[PDB]
């Protein structure tokens, strides 16, 4: 059968998002050589991550209810924020370092290698440390990542279709609140924590904007490339 997004319980939402999670990818460099472009390695990894991101987005409840056109718009707006939140998530347990891959752990000083890269590393590190200080949970993380996908390009857009995106966002909010209530936080505590997490999302937006400026100054997937990737997914084996 098929669940409609708006009928999911909190536990079914959590379960669907956990099940949709992409794998952790490794960097493609020979462990026999030192002698590699940092830019090259990060570009190669991001590219492989994007393929998995397409498969993931298709599994975010509500996403496939939208038109192909609207799906591509959302991904085009959100793809860097999504790569960034995943990065800061897995870097939480590594104070002062970014875990790009289990075989690609980088500090501040290594970031200085590429020009304009150091401001962005620092902002990512601050996000990772804020998430560690808040003890961000995996269940919360998957909800935040889905919120990024559905909200990033909603205002830069068929009005009844917008209510649907807004109703799916309300469902994800409900799911976050339910996780926090089960964790034993009080009402005010539930609200304060929700606020804190949503406010971090504006910082993630900021980082993505700065990231995009930096990428465009030199790689960036266009509406057309994302459309092509979303469409090609239909030809993948089950
Ligand atoms: C994302 C990106 C890039 O993306 C190119 C897009 N690929 C094209 C799509 C069609 F194939 C090209 C070089 C990079 F160094 C990075 C990196 C980068 N790589 C990652 C890999 C996994 C997880 C997170 C990241 C980040 C965040 C972050 C530090 N990124 C730096 C910046 F923010 F993009 C610079 O402004």
Detailed description of the structure:
Strand 1 and strand 2 form a beta hairpin. The radius of gyration is 18 Å and the shape is globular. The chain is mainly α and 238 residues long. The longest helix has 30 residues, at 187-216. It has a single domain (5-235), classed as Orthogonal Bundle (Retinoid X Receptor). The protein has nine helices and two strands. Helix 1 crosses helix 7, helix 5 packs antiparallel against helix 8 and helix 6 runs antiparallel to helix 7. It has a two-stranded antiparallel sheet with strand order 1-2. Bound molecules: ligand H09. The site of ligand H09 has 21 residues, from helix 2, helix 3 and helix 8. Ligand H09 is lined by residues 39, 42-43, 45-47, 49-50, 83-84, 86-87, 100, 120, 211, 214-215, 219-221, 225.
Measured on Cα atoms, how large is the radius of gyration?
A: 18 Å
CATH superfamily: Retinoid X Receptor
- Structural class of the secondary structure composition? mainly alpha
Distinct bound molecules: the ligand Cc1c(OCCNCCCF)ccc(F)c1[C@@H]1c2[nH]c3ccccc3c2C[C@@H](C)N1CC(F)(F)CO
Shape designation:
globular
Q: Order of SSEs, N→C? A: HHHEEHHHHHH
Distance between the termini: 16 Å
State the strand order across the main sheet. Answer: 1-2
The CATH topology label is Retinoid X Receptor
Q: Please report the first level of CATH classification, the CATH class.
A: Mainly Alpha
Biggest β-sheet strands, sense, barrel:
2 strands, antiparallel
Number of strands: 2
The helical percent reads: 55-70%
- From the 3D coordinates, which CATH architecture would you assign? Orthogonal Bundle
* Total domain modules: 1
Helical segment count? 9
Give the DSSP E fraction (strand runs of 2 or more residues): under 5%
PDB class: transcription
Keywords: Ligand-binding domain of oestrogen nuclear hormone receptor, transcription
Assembly: monomeric
Entry title: estrogen receptor alpha in complex with compound 29
